[PDB]
Design a protein around this ligand. Structure first.
Ligand SMILES: Nc1ncnc2[nH]cnc12
Ligand SMILES: Nc1ncnc2[nH]cnc12
Ligand SMILES: [Cl-]
Ligand SMILES: [Cl-]
Ligand SMILES: [Cl-]
Ligand SMILES: [Cl-]
Ligand SMILES: [Cl-]
Ligand code: NA
Ligand code: NA
Lengths: 182, 183
């Protein structure tokens, strides 16, 4: 389990922006962690350590900030990376899941051939808020016969209840940086 | 210090081609089959990192979204910060913007103004070099912030679309792993 020093370094690497993207939200900006070679390397090293003995066979990350954390974790575990994408971007056969945006609905897609029965999948994302894109991604993985019990995040907004919501869907969340607020 | 024939052939054979995606008459070169093969993905990142490990790169810039899948592991391999360039309204801090042509009309790429400073030596990474319009726009962003950029790296080079020569005219040397013909 990560040391207190390591977890505090990561928390202090993330910039917060008052009243973005609207009034009353203190936005947690993971791009300041990406620009610090120490913070970014540590985040990936800590996620690789958590799952190295977990029998993961694929990492799935959602477009686009999910790519930044899922793909290095895949490389660190030595397993394939599978992108979940906005519609119309994947060129081979896909399945789709509909989920809620703040101002409407949208879809996520995955290649049908990218997950099979026998796969044990880790989902990786930058930040856990309501958890809606993760729940949609888990449905894509399970519809292809993949087993997914694990989701990893750089940031957890614990006041938004996403860890408990994902636990009701059989997903255990590992998060490096907890922050309060909406 | 040089890619073997066995390595370059493995990478080329790891990429699937899809006729008439996304519009009739394009043979789409799909890097997602390279991502799903841990051997191919790991190799591709090793080769890009090896080309720049002595070039004094201080930042890697990756274009949203497939660019992130190569630029960010290259940043980690070189032990330097990663800077995303994004479609508008995604980056939360102060940005500047550059316009580039799509097939029809135009779109914008943004960068955080604090991400690049005078003295930075930047590598741009993307999955695939086609016309190179996003890379020309990204180079303009970097130089407006006082960054030095002379290098772009790619997995795929569509050599029939002339992107390498266009980027050479802006002072950019391209490194690519997998050449394919066609548009
Ligand atoms: N405070 C916050 N920071 C980043 N993303 C968020 N999504 C919802 N609330 C957020
Ligand atoms: N054949 C191709 N495959 C992928 N992306 C492209 N962009 C332009 N032509 C392309
Ligand atoms: Cl995103
Ligand atoms: Cl479907
Ligand atoms: Cl279902
Ligand atoms: Cl993309
Ligand atoms: Cl061909
Ligand atoms: Na309000
Ligand atoms: Na803005």
């Amino acid at each position: 389990t990560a040391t207190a020093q390591q977890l505090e370094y990561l928390k202090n690497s993330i910039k917060s922006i008052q009243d973005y993207p609207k009034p009353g939200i203190l936005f947690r900006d993971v791009t300041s962690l990406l620009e610090d070679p120490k913070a970014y390397a540590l985040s990936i090293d800590l996620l690789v350590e958590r799952y190295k003995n977990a029998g993961i066979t694929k990492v799935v990350g959602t477009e686009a900030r999910g790519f930044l954390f899922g793909a290095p974790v895949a490389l660190g575990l030595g397993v394939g990376f599978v992108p979940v994408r906005k519609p119309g971007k994947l060129p081979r056969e896909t399945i789709s899941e509909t989920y809620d945006l703040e101002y409407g609905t949208d879809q996520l897609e995955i290649h049908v051939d990218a997950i099979k029965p026998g796969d044990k999948v880790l989902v990786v994302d930058d930040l856990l808020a309501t958890g809606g894109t993760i729940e949609a991604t888990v449905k894509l993985i399970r519809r292809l016969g993949g087993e997914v019990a694990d989701a990893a995040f750089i940031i957890n907004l614990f006041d938004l209840g996403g860890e408990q919501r994902l636990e009701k869907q059989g997903i255990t969340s590992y998060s490096l940086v907890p922050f309060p607020g909406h």
